[PDB]
Write a protein that binds this DNA or RNA. Sequence first.
RNA 1: UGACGGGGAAUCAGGGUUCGAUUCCGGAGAGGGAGCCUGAGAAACGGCUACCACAUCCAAGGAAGGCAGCAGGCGCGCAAAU
RNA 2: GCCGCUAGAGGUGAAAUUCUUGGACCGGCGCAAGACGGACCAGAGCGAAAGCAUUUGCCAAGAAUGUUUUCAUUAAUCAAGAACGAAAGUCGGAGGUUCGAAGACGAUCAGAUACCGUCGUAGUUCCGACCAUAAACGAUGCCGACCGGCGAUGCGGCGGCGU
RNA 3: AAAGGAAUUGACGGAAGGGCACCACCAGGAGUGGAGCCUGCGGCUUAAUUUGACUCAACACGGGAAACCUCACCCGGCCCGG
RNA 4: GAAGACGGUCGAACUUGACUAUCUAGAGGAAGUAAAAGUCGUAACAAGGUUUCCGUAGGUAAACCUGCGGAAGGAUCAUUA
Lengths: 139, 24, 91
Amino acid sequence: GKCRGLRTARKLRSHRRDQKWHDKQYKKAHLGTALKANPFGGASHAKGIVLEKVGVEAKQPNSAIRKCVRVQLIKNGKKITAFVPNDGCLNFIEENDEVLVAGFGRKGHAVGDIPGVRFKVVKVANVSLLALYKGKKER
Amino acid sequence: MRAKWRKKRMRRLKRKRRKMRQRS
Amino acid sequence: LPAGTEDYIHIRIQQRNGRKTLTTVQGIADDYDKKKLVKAFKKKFACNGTVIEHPEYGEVIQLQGDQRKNICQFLVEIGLAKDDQLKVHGF
RNA sequence: UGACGGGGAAUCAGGGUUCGAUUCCGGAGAGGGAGCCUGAGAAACGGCUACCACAUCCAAGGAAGGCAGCAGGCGCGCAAAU
RNA sequence: GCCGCUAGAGGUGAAAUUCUUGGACCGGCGCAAGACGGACCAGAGCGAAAGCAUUUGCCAAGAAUGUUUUCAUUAAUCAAGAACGAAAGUCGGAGGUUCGAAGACGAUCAGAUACCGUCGUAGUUCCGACCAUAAACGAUGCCGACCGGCGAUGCGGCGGCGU
RNA sequence: AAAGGAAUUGACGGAAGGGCACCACCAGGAGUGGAGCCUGCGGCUUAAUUUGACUCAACACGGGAAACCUCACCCGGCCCGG
RNA sequence: GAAGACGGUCGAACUUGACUAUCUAGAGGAAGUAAAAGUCGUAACAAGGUUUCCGUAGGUAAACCUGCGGAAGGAUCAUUA
């Protein structure tokens, strides 16, 4: 049963102000701790420097070795793991290159079949991987 | 794990932690 | 420090059914008290084991599951070793 | 508080929710702080006096500083013009 | 404690640890100790929930019903705040018959530092001072209204053949 | 990327209750198991002792009682029917 | 009628004390959740082979075991005058 009288607007609004914090998107986007632990800091992309190239195996029902890169970001110095998307697009990358790294499409959660990886690479050295991949530009 | 013994094991862990933290 | 161990130490490992083995130690010391070092054996090797009481013999400790090598790890980590007295009877 | 306020904006069945630095109004500031001269009107900085901070020329005796004006370059950046 | 018989008692799936010719178990009359209140005891009662059981007292307290008694809205729920709150637990004192964590032994198992036996500390018991958790369960907040039946059961009241 | 609630069918039990059958017992008979022998299988040896089958649903079973063929198996050689 | 100077006030700044936000290098040391072909056993689901679970207290490599009180989400809605 709710508090439904006529002079009770303060009880209703100071209830719904406090039970909004149990909603997860309101708490995750309005408390402020998510923006300090996120490696981007609220950006759409981030430029960074490839440290080392990795391969990570897929989760249990798939069997593959997904080709990814470890990037160190210029902007705040944190180190991320990003996935270089298309077929044969690992080979276009030298180490110690500027790559422009975007999120994976699920806004902070890291899934696909690849564990603990939520970043993907769009550019390498100001040429994009679609233009490198189709044969429209060169290195 | 039966949840009472999970509770008891975190009880023993916190009792040892508060033992090790008040020496200094 | 207490007295050094007696002349030789034998490790014997035998089989029981399935994927299992049942491993013994023999003849550590007659002088050494605190022969409830099974409690340090069990809690370091992650195995269930005990001492069974055998007459005129070396106070055999039986552990389940194969450690010959982990005995070699633990006894060179601790005081009592000369590392020429441990004869392995593993198959 | 990644807060200038408002007129307002995008969504919208009714309710809501979120955004508003931004061409109009109102406030505040011209690197940080102070303190003043003139003037009807200022705590003015396309005025002055110092301190802090950073910088230019020098005959090493001294002199002059302020683009959050229009263009422009440095730098930071995912991100912005002659 | 006193008798007066005797070679086993106990305990278990099977046994062994334990007790016994300084006389156990069983039988008899007795004394004392501390705990406990069987059968009657139910989908019955009371309590704000935790809970509560021998008799007779004494001490206050309370629901229900009956009311042509009085007051005249005094009311419902509850931030702050407070009272009680099983068992285990902690401290001070008294008590200690049995049970009994830890522990010492026995035997079951490959191994059991578990269930199964023998004994036992702390506790269980009472008087003070703390602690405020339970599957504290109807896993169901409280007050009021309305909406089909039925046959009993606890209490109080009224009316009816009888026995 | 499910964890969970209630409900149906099935499998399973170291649960409760019925039913059937000489591939169950009871009433009983001939037996088998101990003995020599044929024969199969386990091992052991071999150059090979080919082989499938291992609780009924393997072991006188491959209709398999092989002297050559059978014939897979061994030692040595001809042969294209490349 | 200029410099200067005693005093007054507004007072930036420096000095040594505090205390208190935000980020950073943290030797060690203690925890997780995934990966799932490691090792030791089976504690839970069937009366899961000792019915499970809750509160508390002690112990033990480990799941866990035992005590005292409570629950059926139990393996009984019931057992006789």
